[PDB]
Structure formats: structure tokens, C-alpha cells
Amino acid sequence: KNPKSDKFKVKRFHHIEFWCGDATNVARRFSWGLGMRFSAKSDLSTGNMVHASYLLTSGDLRFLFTAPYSPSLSAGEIKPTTTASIPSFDHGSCRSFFSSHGLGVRAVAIEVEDAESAFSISVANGAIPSSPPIVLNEAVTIAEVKLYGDVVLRYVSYKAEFLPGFERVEDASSFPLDYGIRRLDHAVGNVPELGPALTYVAGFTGFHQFAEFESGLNSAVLASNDEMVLLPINEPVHGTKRKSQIQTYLEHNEGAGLQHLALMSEDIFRTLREMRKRSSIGGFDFMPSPPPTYYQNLKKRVGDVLSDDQIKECEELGILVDRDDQGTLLQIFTKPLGDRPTIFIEIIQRVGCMMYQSGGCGGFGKGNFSELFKSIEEYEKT
Amino acid sequence: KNPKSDKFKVKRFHHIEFWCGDATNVARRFSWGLGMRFSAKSDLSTGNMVHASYLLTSGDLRFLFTAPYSPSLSAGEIKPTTTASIPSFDHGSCRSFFSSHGLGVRAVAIEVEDAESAFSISVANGAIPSSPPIVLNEAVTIAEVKLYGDVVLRYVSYKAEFLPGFERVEDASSFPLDYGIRRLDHAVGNVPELGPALTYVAGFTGFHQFAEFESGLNSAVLASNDEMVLLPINEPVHGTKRKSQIQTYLEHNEGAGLQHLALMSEDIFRTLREMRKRSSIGGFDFMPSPPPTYYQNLKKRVGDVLSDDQIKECEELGILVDRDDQGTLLQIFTKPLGDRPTIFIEIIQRVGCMMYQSGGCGGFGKGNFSELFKSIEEYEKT
Numbered sequence: 001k002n003p004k005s006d007k008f009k010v011k012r013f014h015h016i017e018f019w020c021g022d023a024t025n026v027a028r029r030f031s032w033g034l035g036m037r038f039s040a041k042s043d044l045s046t047g048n049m050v051h052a053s054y055l056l057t058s059g060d061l062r063f064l065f066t067a068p069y070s071p072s073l074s075a076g077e078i079k080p081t082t083t084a085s086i087p088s089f090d091h092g093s094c095r096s097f098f099s100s101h102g103l104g105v106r107a108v109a110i111e112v113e114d115a116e117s118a119f120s121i122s123v124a125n126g127a128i129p130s131s132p133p134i135v136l137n138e139a140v141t142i143a144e145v146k147l148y149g150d151v152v153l154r155y156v157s158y159k160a161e162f163l164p165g166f167e168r169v170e171d172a173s174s175f176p177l178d179y180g181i182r183r184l185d186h187a188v189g190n191v192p193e194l195g196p197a198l199t200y201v202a203g204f205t206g207f208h209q210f211a212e213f214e215s216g217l218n219s220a221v222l223a224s225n226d227e228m229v230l231l232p233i234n235e236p237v238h239g240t241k242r243k244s245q246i247q248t249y250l251e252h253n254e255g256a257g258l259q260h261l262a263l264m265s266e267d268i269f270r271t272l273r274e275m276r277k278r279s280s281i282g283g284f285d286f287m288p289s290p291p292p293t294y295y296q297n298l299k300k301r302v303g304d305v306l307s308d309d310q311i312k313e314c315e316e317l318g319i320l321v322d323r324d325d326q327g328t329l330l331q332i333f334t335k336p337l338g339d340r341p342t343i344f345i346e347i348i349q350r351v352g353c354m355m356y357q358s359g360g361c362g363g364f365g366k367g368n369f370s371e372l373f374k375s376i377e378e379y380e381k382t
Numbered sequence: 383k384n385p386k387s388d389k390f391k392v393k394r395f396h397h398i399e400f401w402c403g404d405a406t407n408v409a410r411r412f413s414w415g416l417g418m419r420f421s422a423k424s425d426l427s428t429g430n431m432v433h434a435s436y437l438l439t440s441g442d443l444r445f446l447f448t449a450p451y452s453p454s455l456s457a458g459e460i461k462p463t464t465t466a467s468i469p470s471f472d473h474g475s476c477r478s479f480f481s482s483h484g485l486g487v488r489a490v491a492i493e494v495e496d497a498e499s500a501f502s503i504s505v506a507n508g509a510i511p512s513s514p515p516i517v518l519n520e521a522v523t524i525a526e527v528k529l530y531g532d533v534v535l536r537y538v539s540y541k542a543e544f545l546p547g548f549e550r551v552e553d554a555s556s557f558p559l560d561y562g563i564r565r566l567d568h569a570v571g572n573v574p575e576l577g578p579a580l581t582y583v584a585g586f587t588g589f590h591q592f593a594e595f596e597s598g599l600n601s602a603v604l605a606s607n608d609e610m611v612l613l614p615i616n617e618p619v620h621g622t623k624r625k626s627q628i629q630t631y632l633e634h635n636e637g638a639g640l641q642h643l644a645l646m647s648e649d650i651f652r653t654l655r656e657m658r659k660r661s662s663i664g665g666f667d668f669m670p671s672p673p674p675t676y677y678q679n680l681k682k683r684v685g686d687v688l689s690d691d692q693i694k695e696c697e698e699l700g701i702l703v704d705r706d707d708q709g710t711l712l713q714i715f716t717k718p719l720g721d722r723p724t725i726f727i728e729i730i731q732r733v734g735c736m737m738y739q740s741g742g743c744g745g746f747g748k749g750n751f752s753e754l755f756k757s758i759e760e761y762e763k764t
């Protein structure tokens with residue numbers, strides 16, 4: 001069931017913004033680890049005396065990395081005279097965010113038809129305002145409302161080059177890395193209480209619940225009209241044998257925040273080969289692979305979707321496979337991206353649901369909790 | 383002239399500690415960019431609820447990267463019951479340092495015979511105490527005094543495995559990168575006033591002035607008895623045609639601090655080839671190369687030390703060459719390591735002064751200021 005109840009016209013995920021202590025080092029690490037190209041900058045060299053912001057791109061995926069300069073560089077400025085290219089930025093907010101949460105996502109940005117209208121309608125429907133609509137160079141409008149914790153939902157709308165005041169990165173400094181990642185599939189929040197979080201976000205967006213089919217969590221997925229903007233949310237389940245990963249997140253993050261970003265690959269086997277080659281030379285690490293019993297049991301579940309060779313390719317890369325009633329999901333999870341056991345990345349590829357591919361084809365892999373446990377127990381038996 | 387006036391027995395540079403917002407991302411970037419191996423850790427996985435610390439090594443060079451966790455993880459602790467492996471660490475100090483200065487060196491650590499004695503003698507001779515001597519697992523003693531700005535001089539002494547409480551990094555997560563860097567040659571501070579800075583540091587160490595032969599700076603070099611611990615200091619020269627790079631540093635750093643680390647390579651040509659291959663894929667960028675007039679003029683100055691081919695290798699890597707009356711210096715400078723125009727790295731290799739090689743052989747390249755300007759002007763002519 002999809003009532004298509006969006007209260008304003010939503011297009012696609014636009015970008016994800018990380019708030020960092022040093023944007024340069026995080027961006028260079030992410031670029032190498034994920035195969036993303038440096039494509040735009042806003043920093044001292046572009047006249048921005050407030051913040052350093054570096055944009056990485058892979059296909060349609062946009063990762064922005066921002067850190068504050070010394071406030072003394074911009075002490076003479078006022079908001080009317082700011083040199084910040086993202087006028088919602090605040091030194092105190094950014095330092096407080098990073099000192100409280102460590103490295104993490106500050107903004108989940110979606111493109112809309114009219115960011116001023118989206119902001120107005122959202123706030124009229126219960127959204128907590130974060131930054132009012134601001135028109136940049138009469139070309140782009142940005143506005144922000146609170147999503148959960150200190151994460152904001154950022155609306156961006158264009159009249160007709162990432163943002164004004166950003167400069168394209170010289171091709172010498174712009175190496176064309178590409179490991180196959182193409183777009184953001186979903187962005188997942190961890191909260192202490194799922195019910196109130198869903199009521200709040202569904203309240204001001206009109207996003208609807210995307211239906212699913214002792215893991216430590218309850219979850220639900222909010223979706224836009226065409227189900228291309230997907231915002232799952234988790235809460236912990238307490239009193240379990242193994243401590244809930246959601247609760248550990250909430251403790252180390254100092255509360256609610258963004259838990260994982262799922263990045264769609266046009267060839268998850270190539271992406272994982274390339275990322276795994278770089279794990280120990282500056283890139284990202286992956287969770288430990290499931291036991292071979294998991295891939296032995298892969299035949300009876302998806303033996304009609306993947307050949308035995310393609311199943312062999314999954315086992316040597318540690319890829320997980322799940323299936324709903326409409327499609328098949330290939331997925332794998334990185335270890336946490338930074339010092340704290342908080343944010344991580346998921347790499348995914350979806351098989352099926354062609355009409356273009358419909359959003360969420362194959363689900364989100366919730367079945368892989370049970371299959372993992374079953375495999376683990378029956379691998380010990382063997 | 384070397385009066386050998388050290389007030390306590392100093393051995394060698396031991397390590398450099400960076401205070402970071404996220405130690406993981408900075409360390410992974412530096413590892414790939416410089417060819418340093420992950421060799422030790424102290425973090426949540428080792429029981430440290432206070433800070434994450436990751437050690438990179440290349441030869442005898444030791445880079446430590448540290449960032450604070452949420453203070454809430456260790457709220458029950460007191461200094462007697464701390465789980466921090468570096469007991470001088472302070473959450474508030476670290477967040478204040480990083481919010482004030484951005485990514486940079488907090489500690490220049492030297493090995494001494496007796497860190498408690500070095501601390502006592504230093505403070506008795508005017509050193510401002512930072513962290514008193516603390517004996518770790520009855521095996522290592524660390525103490526800290528102020529050096530300049532918020533940078534500390536850290537004394538470490540061993541009775542007879544980096545520090546207690548650190549664990550060796552599993553060889554799977556430990557890729558044996560090596561681009562030829564072997565040790566720290568010198569560590570350079572920027573201050574507003576050179577005179578008082580030298581008087582202070584020479585006052586409590588007994589280090590002596592290491593003699594040199596409109597660049598925007600005045601400088602001097604303090605040295606230990608065998609001139610293997612080398613601590614240059616710069617001050618700006620104001621009212622110049624081009625703004626002093628020292629003054630720009632002081633402005634963007636919010637005051638005095640560590641300006642550059644010079645890393646000795648056992649083969650600067652291999653090091654630069656390897657680092658330059660990685661500049662645009664996560665590594666470090668280098669300052670723009672001198673014009674070919676510079677390398678044309680290289681024959682008449684060092685044509686007796688380097689062949690024409692080895693001079694050719696210098697021009698294609700952008701390496702600078704200088705000479706004193708005892709040896710020859712090969713050097714090159716990176717662009718700043720992080721967001722701010724503050725800290726950078728120098729790669730060096732020294733030729734001559736064999737007896738082992740004596741410290742500072744060839745000087746520090748101060749002659750390369752004039753040679754660069756001369757080359758620049760006479761390249762425009764050609």
C-alpha cells in the first residue's frame with residue numbers, strides 16, 4: 001500500500017553532509033576508500049572564511065565534508081555579509097556537534113521542487129525548524145528542519161554548480177576514481193523510541209510506511225511518493241542476550257543520529273573487490289564474513305537468481321543476499337567509519353522490480369539477521 | 383661551536399603526537415600518503431574508554447594520532463582509576479586544542495635516560511610544567527613541559543611495546559607500506575617573538591644554538607649534545623612585500639605552534655615518486671616545483687655531488703637542493719596537511735658529514751629562499 005501522501009513534491013536524495021574536525025583528511029580518506037572523485041570545493045581558496053567544504057561524487061552520490069575554520073577569520077562578518085557558502089553553518093553548532101557525536105552526518109539533503117514551500121509546509125505540520133529558507137545567488141534555495149538528534153533534513157531546490165560559491169575542482173587535483181558506486185539508496189537513523197520518531201517525521205513530510213516482508217532492534221521505513229527517498233529508523237530492543245547494537249550506538253554517539261548510509265552499486269562485485277583491496281591501505285574495513293554454511297544455504301534461497309559462480313563470487317567477497325516477494329538484495333556492511341562504534345556504510349545492489357527499477361526492490365535485508373544466526377550455529381555443528 | 387650543555391641526557395626523537403577530531407581517518411590518510419605502517423593501538427578494543435590512539439611507524443619514525451571519545455564513557459573514572467593509556471590526556475584540553483588550532487601536533491616526544499629527572503631539572507630551570515612524571519606499569523616514565531603555544535615537549539624514558547596499554551596491530555590490519563622514510567630529522571615551531579621563545583627553551587633544556595651558513599622570517603635552531611634532536615623556531619618579519627608565511631600561520635593557528643616536521647628518507651627519489659603517485663588519490667600534495675632555471679643553476683652549485691642524471695631526477699620530482707660547508711641537503715615541502723594553512727611536512731635527505739652521519743649535515747635549506755627568488759625572476763626573463 002502506497003497512499004502517495006507527500007505534502008510537497010520530493011525528487012531524489014541530493015547529498016549527505018558530514019561534519020568533521022578536519023574536512024581535508026576525512027575527504028581524502030573517503031575518496032580513496034570508496035572510489036569517489038573530488039568535484040567541488042568551498043574554502044579559503046574560494047573566499048570562504050568560515051568553513052572548509054569538499055564535495056566527493058560517484059555517479060549521482062554526493063558526499064560533502066565540512067569543518068569550521070577559526071571563528072577569528074570571520075569575526076567581522078554578520079549573516080548579511082557572510083562568506084560561508086552554506087549559510088546554515090554555525091561554528092558553535094559544528095564544534096558542539098562534533099565534540100558531542102564525533103564524525104557523522106549532519107545533513108540528509110533531498111532535492112525538492114520548492115525548498116521554501118517544503119520548509120513552510122513541513123513546519124506547519126510539526127517540523128522543528130533548523131535553518132529558514134535562504135536563496136543563494138537567486139539560483140538555489142536551501143532550508144533545514146530537524147530530523148532526529150542533531151541531524152537535519154535539508155531541502156534544496158533549483159530554479160533551472162553544486163551550490164553557488166562552490167568551485168569545480170581542477171582536473172589535476174581531480175583523479176577519476178570509480179569503484180562502481182552510483183547513488184544513495186537509503187539513510188538510516190537510530191533513535192531511543194521508534195514510535196515518536198516515526199510520528200514526527202511522517203507527520204511533517206507525508207512520507208508513508210514502506211512495508212517489510214531477537215535481532216536487537218525494531219525498525220520501520222518511511223518513503224516518498226515514488227519510494228526513491230527512503231528513510232528507515234531503528235530503536236533498540238533491551239534485555240537481550242547480546243547487547244543491542246542500537247543501544248551501543250546511542251551511548252557512543254551521545255543520543256540519536258544517523259546509523260548507516262546504503263550506497264547502491266551498479267556492480268557490487270567490482271565495488272567490493274576494489275574496496276577490499278584498499279581496506280588496509282587507507283580505505284574501509286568490512287564486517288567479518290558469514291561462515292561458508294551461509295553460502296551453502298544460498299542455493300535453496302536464491303539459486304534461481306544467481307548462478308553457482310555468482311554465488312561463489314558472493315562468498316569470496318563476504319556479500320549477503322536477501323529476497324522479498326518482488327526482488328533480490330545483495331548487501332554488505334563496513335566497520336564503523338571513524339573512531340566511534342556509530343556510523344557505518346552499507347553497499348547494496350538490487351535485482352528485479354523493473355517497469356527503471358522501483359525503490360526498495362528486495363527490501364533491506366532484515367531476513368539476513370536470522371540467516372546469519374542459523375548459519376553461525378550450523379557452522380559450529382559442521 | 384657546540385658547548386654540549388644539555389642539562390639532562392637526551393637520546394633521540396621518540397614520537398610525534400597529533401591531536402585529531404577523528405584519529406582513525408587522519409591515521410588512515412597519513413598511512414597511505416606517507417607509507418607508514420599501522421603498528422600499535424590503544425582504543426575501545428584495548429580497554430581505553432578515554433581516547434583512541436593509533437601509532438604509525440616508518441623505520442624509526444613514530445606518528446601517533448589521538449582523539450577523545452565521549453567523556454560519558456569514562457565519567458565514573460578518576461585519574462587513579464583511568465583507562466587512558468596516556469595519562470596526560472585531557473578531554474577538555476584536547477577539544478580546546480583542536481577547536482582552537484585544528485589538526486596539529488600536540489606533543490614532540492624525545493627519549494631521555496630518566497624522564498622524572500628531565501622533568502625536575504627542566505622545571506627547576508624555568509620550564510612550565512604540563513604533566514608531571516607518571517610511571518606506567520613500572521616500565522616507562524612520561525612527563526611533559528610546555529614548549530610553545532599548546533605544544534608540549536614530552537620526555538619518555540624506559541627501564542629496559544610502544545607504551546604500556548598499547549597493543550600491537552594484527553598483521554592483517556597491518557599492511558607493510560614503506561616509501562623510504564626512516565626518522566624525524568627536525569621539528570619546527572612558529573612563534574610571534576623568536577628571542578623569548580629561544581631563551582625559554584634553551585633555558586630549561588641546555589640545548590645550544592646550531593649555527594647556520596626578505597624571506598619573511600627570522601629563525602634559529604636549538605640542538606642537543608650530539609645535535610640529533612633539532613628544534614628550529616621561526617618568527618615573522620613584518621612589513622614585507624609578500625606577507626610572511628609565519629604570520630599567516632599564527633593567524634590561522636590561533637597563535638604559536640608546530641609549523642613543520644622534517645622526515646629523513648633513505649632515498650628521497652623513491653619517497654617522492656611514491657608520495658607523488660598518491661597525491662590525488664588520498665595522499666599529500668607538494669608545493670609547486672621551482673622553474674627549470676633552478677635546475678639549470680643546480681650544476682654550478684652541486685655538480686660535484688650529484689650527477690646530471692641525479693639532477694634530472696631532482697627536477698622531475700621538484701626536489702630542492704642546498705649546501706653548507708659540511709654537506710648537501712635534498713628537500714621538498716608538502717602543502718598543508720589539513721584544512722588550515724598551518725602545519726606541513728618536509729621530506730629530506732642529507733649527503734655527507736660521515737664519521738654514522740652527524741646531525742644537521744647540510745643545514746636546513748635557508749639558502750633555497752634566495753635561489754628560488756633568483757630562479758623565479760630569471761625564468762621570467764627566459
Ligand SMILES: Cn1c(=O)n(-c2ccccc2)c(=O)c2cc(C(=O)C3=C(O)CCCC3=O)ccc21
Nearest residue numbers: 188219220232245287333346364365366368369
Ligand atoms: C544482517 N545485518 C547486520 O548484521 N547488521 C550489522 C552490521 C554491523 C554490525 C552488526 C550488525 C546490520 O546492520 C544490518 C542492517 C540491515 C539494514 O540495513 C536495515 C535497514 O536498512 C532498515 C530496516 C532495518 C534493517 O535491518 C540489515 C541487515 C543487517
Ligand SMILES: Cn1c(=O)n(-c2ccccc2)c(=O)c2cc(C(=O)C3=C(O)CCCC3=O)ccc21
Nearest residue numbers: 570601602614627669715728746747748750751
Ligand atoms: C625554501 N623554503 C620554502 O620555500 N618554504 C616554503 C614552504 C611552503 C610555502 C612557502 C614557503 C619553506 O618552508 C622552507 C623551509 C625551510 C626550513 O625548513 C627551515 C628550517 O627547517 C629551520 C631554519 C629556518 C628554515 O628556513 C627552508 C626552506 C624553505
Ligand SMILES: [Co+2]
Nearest residue numbers: 188262346364
Ligand atoms: Co540498510
Ligand SMILES: [Co+2]
Nearest residue numbers: 570644728746
Ligand atoms: Co626544515
